[PDB]
Amino acid sequence: GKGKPRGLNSARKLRVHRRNNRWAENNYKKRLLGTAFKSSPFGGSSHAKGIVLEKLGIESKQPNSAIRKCVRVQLIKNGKKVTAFVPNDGCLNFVDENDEVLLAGFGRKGKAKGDIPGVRFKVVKVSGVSLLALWKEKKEKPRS
Amino acid sequence: SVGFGLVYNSVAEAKKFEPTYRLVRYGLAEKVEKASRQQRKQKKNRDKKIFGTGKRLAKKVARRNAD
Amino acid sequence: PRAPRTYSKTYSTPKRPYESSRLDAELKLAGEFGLKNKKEIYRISFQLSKIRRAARDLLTRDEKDPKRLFEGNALIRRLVRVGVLSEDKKKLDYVLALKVEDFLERRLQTQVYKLGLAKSVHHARVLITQRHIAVGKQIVNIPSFMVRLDSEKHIDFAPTSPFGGARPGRVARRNAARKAEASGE
Amino acid sequence: AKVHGSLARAGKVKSQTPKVEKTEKPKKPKGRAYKRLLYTRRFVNVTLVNGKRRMNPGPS
Amino acid sequence: ARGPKKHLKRLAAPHHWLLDKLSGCYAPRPSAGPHKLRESLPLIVFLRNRLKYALNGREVKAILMQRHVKVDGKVRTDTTYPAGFMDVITLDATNENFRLVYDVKGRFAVHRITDEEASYKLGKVKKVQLGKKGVPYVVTHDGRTIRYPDPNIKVNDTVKIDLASGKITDFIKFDAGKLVYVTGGRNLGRIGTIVHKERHDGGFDLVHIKDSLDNTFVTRLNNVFVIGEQGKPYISLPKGKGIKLSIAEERDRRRAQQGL
RNA sequence: AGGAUAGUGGCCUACCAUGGUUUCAACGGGUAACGGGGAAUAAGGGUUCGAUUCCGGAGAGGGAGCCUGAGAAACGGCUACCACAUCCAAGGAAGGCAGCAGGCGCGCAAAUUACCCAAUCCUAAUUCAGGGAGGUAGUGACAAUAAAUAACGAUACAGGGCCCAUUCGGGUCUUGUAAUUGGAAUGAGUACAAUGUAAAUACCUUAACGAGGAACAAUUGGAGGGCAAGUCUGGUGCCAGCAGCCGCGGUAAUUCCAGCUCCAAUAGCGUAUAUUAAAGUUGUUGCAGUUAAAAAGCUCGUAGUUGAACUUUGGGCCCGGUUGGCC
RNA sequence: GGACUUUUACUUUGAAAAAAUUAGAGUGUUCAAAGCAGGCGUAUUGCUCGAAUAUAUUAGCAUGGAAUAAUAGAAUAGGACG
Numbered sequence A: 001g002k003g004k005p006r007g008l009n010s011a012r013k014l015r016v017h018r019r020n021n022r023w024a025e026n027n028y029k030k031r032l033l034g035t036a037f038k039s040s041p042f043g044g045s046s047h048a049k050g051i052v053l054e055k056l057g058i059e060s061k062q063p064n065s066a067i068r069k070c071v072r073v074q075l076i077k078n079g080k081k082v083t084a085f086v087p088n089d090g091c092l093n094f095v096d097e098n099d100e101v102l103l104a105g106f107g108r109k110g111k112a113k114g115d116i117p118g119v120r121f122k123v124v125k126v127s128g129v130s131l132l133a134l135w136k137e138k139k140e141k142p143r144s
Numbered sequence B: 001s002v003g004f005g006l007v008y009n010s011v012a013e014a015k016k017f018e019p020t021y022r023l024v025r026y027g028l029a030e031k032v033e034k035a036s037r038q039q040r041k042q043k044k045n046r047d048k049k050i051f052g053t054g055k056r057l058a059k060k061v062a063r064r065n066a067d
Numbered sequence C: 001p002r003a004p005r006t007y008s009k010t011y012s013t014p015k016r017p018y019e020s021s022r023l024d025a026e027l028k029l030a031g032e033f034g035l036k037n038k039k040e041i042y043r044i045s046f047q048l049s050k051i052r053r054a055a056r057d058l059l060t061r062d063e064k065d066p067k068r069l070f071e072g073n074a075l076i077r078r079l080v081r082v083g084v085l086s087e088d089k090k091k092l093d094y095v096l097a098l099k100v101e102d103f104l105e106r107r108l109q110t111q112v113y114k115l116g117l118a119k120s121v122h123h124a125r126v127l128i129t130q131r132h133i134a135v136g137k138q139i140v141n142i143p144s145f146m147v148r149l150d151s152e153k154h155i156d157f158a159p160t161s162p163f164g165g166a167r168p169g170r171v172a173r174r175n176a177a178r179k180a181e182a183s184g185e
Numbered sequence D: 001a002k003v004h005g006s007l008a009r010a011g012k013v014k015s016q017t018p019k020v021e022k023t024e025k026p027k028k029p030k031g032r033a034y035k036r037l038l039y040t041r042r043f044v045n046v047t048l049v050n051g052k053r054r055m056n057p058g059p060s
Numbered sequence E: 001a002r003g004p005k006k007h008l009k010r011l012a013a014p015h016h017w018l019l020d021k022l023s024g025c026y027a028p029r030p031s032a033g034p035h036k037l038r039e040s041l042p043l044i045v046f047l048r049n050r051l052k053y054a055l056n057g058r059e060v061k062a063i064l065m066q067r068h069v070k071v072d073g074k075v076r077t078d079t080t081y082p083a084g085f086m087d088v089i090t091l092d093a094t095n096e097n098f099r100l101v102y103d104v105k106g107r108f109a110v111h112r113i114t115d116e117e118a119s120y121k122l123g124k125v126k127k128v129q130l131g132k133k134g135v136p137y138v139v140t141h142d143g144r145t146i147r148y149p150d151p152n153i154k155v156n157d158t159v160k161i162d163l164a165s166g167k168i169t170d171f172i173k174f175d176a177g178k179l180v181y182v183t184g185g186r187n188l189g190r191i192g193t194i195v196h197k198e199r200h201d202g203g204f205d206l207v208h209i210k211d212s213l214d215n216t217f218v219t220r221l222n223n224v225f226v227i228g229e230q231g232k233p234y235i236s237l238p239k240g241k242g243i244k245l246s247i248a249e250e251r252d253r254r255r256a257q258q259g260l
Numbered sequence F: 001a002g003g004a005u006a007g008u009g010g011c012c013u014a015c016c017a018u019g020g021u022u023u024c025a026a027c028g029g030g031u032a033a034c035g036g037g038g039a040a041u042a043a044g045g046g047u048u049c050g051a052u053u054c055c056g057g058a059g060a061g062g063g064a065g066c067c068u069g070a071g072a073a074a075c076g077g078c079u080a081c082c083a084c085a086u087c088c089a090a091g092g093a094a095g096g097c098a099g100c101a102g103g104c105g106c107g108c109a110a111a112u113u114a115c116c117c118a119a120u121c122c123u124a125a126u127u128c129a130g131g132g133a134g135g136u137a138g139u140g141a142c143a144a145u146a147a148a149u150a151a152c153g154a155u156a157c158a159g160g161g162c163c164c165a166u167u168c169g170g171g172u173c174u175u176g177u178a179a180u181u182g183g184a185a186u187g188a189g190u191a192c193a194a195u196g197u198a199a200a201u202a203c204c205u206u207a208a209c210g211a212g213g214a215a216c217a218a219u220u221g222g223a224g225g226g227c228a229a230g231u232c233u234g235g236u237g238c239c240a241g242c243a244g245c246c247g248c249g250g251u252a253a254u255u256c257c258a259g260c261u262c263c264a265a266u267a268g269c270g271u272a273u274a275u276u277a278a279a280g281u282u283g284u285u286g287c288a289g290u291u292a293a294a295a296a297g298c299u300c301g302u303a304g305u306u307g308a309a310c311u312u313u314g315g316g317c318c319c320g321g322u323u324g325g326c327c
Numbered sequence G: 001g002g003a004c005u006u007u008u009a010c011u012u013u014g015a016a017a018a019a020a021u022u023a024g025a026g027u028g029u030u031c032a033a034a035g036c037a038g039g040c041g042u043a044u045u046g047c048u049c050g051a052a053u054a055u056a057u058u059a060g061c062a063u064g065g066a067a068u069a070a071u072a073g074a075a076u077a078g079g080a081c082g
């Protein structure tokens, strides 16, 4: 019974069956294929720097109506283009075009967050200054 | 306070078995006025480039300067 | 390179951050014993969990086991010496009944409060921190000193402290000088 | 997917909110003193107990 | 790699030296000599760490370069000289002699001996071979060769060396009911009597040893060192006589001593 | 069989034979692979990590070759070729920081071109010389330990206490509130000095100075639920924004922006990425497959896995110990 | 020395399996993380406790057992015993 071998000398069958079915997990498949290294905007990194290409107004998903004020940026280390959300009231006037930003994920390891469709990154800093510090007026955006 | 202590037999045994830094601390021996470690090493490396005493090249460059 | 140093954490955070049933119990303990924060309770809980684990895993084995005898006697002796466990109820199964309040009442703050000289646990803590208490001849300014049942009779004001004598005090000196000036001389 | 999404309206509410300065109040004690006052405010001075213990009740 | 190593990192030194983890990145690497470095005690370790006659290696060198210390009757000014089991260390001042024997906890213990015992030493026969010109000789455990030995001296026997001339004054055969000393393994420091031995052709002869108070254990033949007969050892035993009390009754003795 | 090697060996050569490995996975491909001691987590079983303090291996821009030597296929040795790079009077000559410090570049990502051989050890002809090995300090919120930002004093008081509190009257021990009002306690910081150390800087001590807003002023993140904490007050009106998830915002928003208040951890707190438990959502322990995903259309069949029962059982005699009803 | 051996799986016990790390004994680093120190005399020129212990798998090596599972024997007797 149970549809799996039980004999004392069936360890090879059990180990191989577990190895084969292990490929149906998400995390095991990503680790073994090296997807983060190969197919991921960051090179497996938590943060990445980019140059802002343009400012975008992303419409909110149902049942919400809003313009989400994102930026299209190109990463320095690999040249990939991503969309990053700029989190706070305002803070899109702090970003500007051709500026340098630092990006993190939202927190869902991919998996666009909330009502923002197809956006997986958020801006942490611009021109070397924390966006939170610029929003709280602790610091000021450098001219350069 | 808690510390350590040694008492020797006479002056000479202390002055031979005691480290230089403690001799200098107690005033028995003076501090040797040596150059800094870096410039000492640089001078040693400079002398490494010289084979022999150096009077040969010294008078040769003196001839070149006073020709 | 030089051999690595060994260090460990002395506390563990609870699995559930926000549960009122123990949040208020922790605030009760902190208010009763004049503790700075919840880490001071977490440390005692970590220590007591270690001791309870040791006693449980050492009672699971039968008597007259040399392992159980040696480590059980060592743990019993240590707890009795520090005073968290009384002279009576001196057994491993009686170790499991220990509570955080036992170590908290064996803290230096608690004893300094109990034997007069403090009138309050908060006064006890500031008194200890301000180098006014000597457990023996030694000034101890650590409120969690964990007195060990043989230094209780020896807790008094430090001889180098104004409460111990021989010094009036910084502010006392300043105002004595000012008061003498305002009086005359 | 609204390419025409108006970005000119960013910061509207935070710009138009009336600026109200924080009031000057005495400093609150920090550390064991703060735990002391919290203990008194929660276990000794139990002010509002309407129905059950209430910890941030409003006026009325 | 590329040649012999000259450094010994601390935490890689033998544990029985009892070196403090801190206060130094390195440990005294024993020089080549009569004993393997794993089961040897360097002079600097014995003089500084064990006897506290020196504060540091500089003072150890100051001691040695004055010809004060001598091992087995020779000055041996080498700081890291590998003094090992059964060796006799002599200090010209303080009028004392030491014999290097492990205590029961498997480490060399500071054991003082008299001049008569310091005059000689014991050695374990590692091999009996015919040398050049047909001259027989034996090799002891401390890397010593003695020509013209007794014909009845076989391998793993014990010989008594006069230590003033490298000559054998007596020998003990390896036989049942003889007091042996364990020099390796988990039984370092034990002193007991041979019960019997297991042959095991193909390697690792096994010896059964009974303690004085009837603790029976087994050990490899390579760790067995004959030191006499049932009672009356040829060498003064260290304090303890190698019995290996259990930790509970060591605790009980410690408490009886401390608390009177 | 010979040659070569320090030596065994297809290590190489001559001749001969046709062998050797493989579904019990050879061979090939990939590795964001140096192996291990070990680390994180962890009821048990496991999962994940290990470039990095110890051990072993390998390498010194990439290859190859070699000298000297006991020991090197060495690179702070040489030789050549390749790539890179320096000086030049143009003839030529000199190079190898994956040692220490430091610079450029790279990126999310990592410190002084400091002091010293005093300690640990190492090397030499050697007690003495040398050692960026090592140690000391600098930078340093990687991580960890301990724990300052205050503690004691006036007048209304729910009366929780005693003459049936019949009088804001009385010792009711009252911790418990109202910018008030008073002394006392002290280290953060400063520096006599000594100690500390090769010298020092700090630490432990210590003469004086050092508190009233003790301005000597604690932060971070939250207050719908998960999940502790607001039907408080303004502003906004599906906008701006918030929101891990569910959701909150279209004129009375407990969810946004603020003020007040409160909560949580606290010299730390939040965020991102990865990983572990939670996960009996990888399963041996221990899943599921009629309908939720999942019984090959059916049968044959090799490897693999697994395979009925039976052969000396049962009886007696001795020796030799014990959480156990009286020396 | 041979008129000397069916072969295993399995299980017991034992030798070894670096140190550090881990668990853990002792010790007022003022407490603690730590470290492996320290403690006691009248200090009249000295006595002394330590620096334990446990585990570290699979394979190999010995070693007691012979239930369980496999393997072999005497069928054209080319069989055993002297």
Ligand SMILES: [Mg+2]
Binding pocket: E001
């Ligand atoms: Mg090397």
Ligand SMILES: [Mg+2]
Binding pocket: none
């Ligand atoms: Mg050949």
Ligand SMILES: [Mg+2]
Binding pocket: none
């Ligand atoms: Mg051949």
Ligand SMILES: [Mg+2]
Binding pocket: F033, F034
């Ligand atoms: Mg690699």
Ligand SMILES: [Mg+2]
Binding pocket: F050
């Ligand atoms: Mg590694």
Ligand SMILES: [Mg+2]
Binding pocket: F059
């Ligand atoms: Mg190499």
Ligand SMILES: [Mg+2]
Binding pocket: F069
């Ligand atoms: Mg040579």
Ligand SMILES: [Mg+2]
Binding pocket: F076, F097
């Ligand atoms: Mg170099």
Ligand SMILES: [Mg+2]
Binding pocket: none
């Ligand atoms: Mg080199």
Ligand SMILES: [Mg+2]
Binding pocket: none
């Ligand atoms: Mg460098």
Ligand SMILES: [Mg+2]
Binding pocket: none
């Ligand atoms: Mg270094």
Ligand SMILES: [Mg+2]
Binding pocket: none
């Ligand atoms: Mg709010």
Ligand SMILES: [Mg+2]
Binding pocket: none
């Ligand atoms: Mg709630």
Ligand SMILES: [Mg+2]
Binding pocket: none
């Ligand atoms: Mg279906």
Ligand SMILES: [Mg+2]
Binding pocket: none
């Ligand atoms: Mg079917």
Ligand SMILES: [Mg+2]
Binding pocket: none
């Ligand atoms: Mg089909």
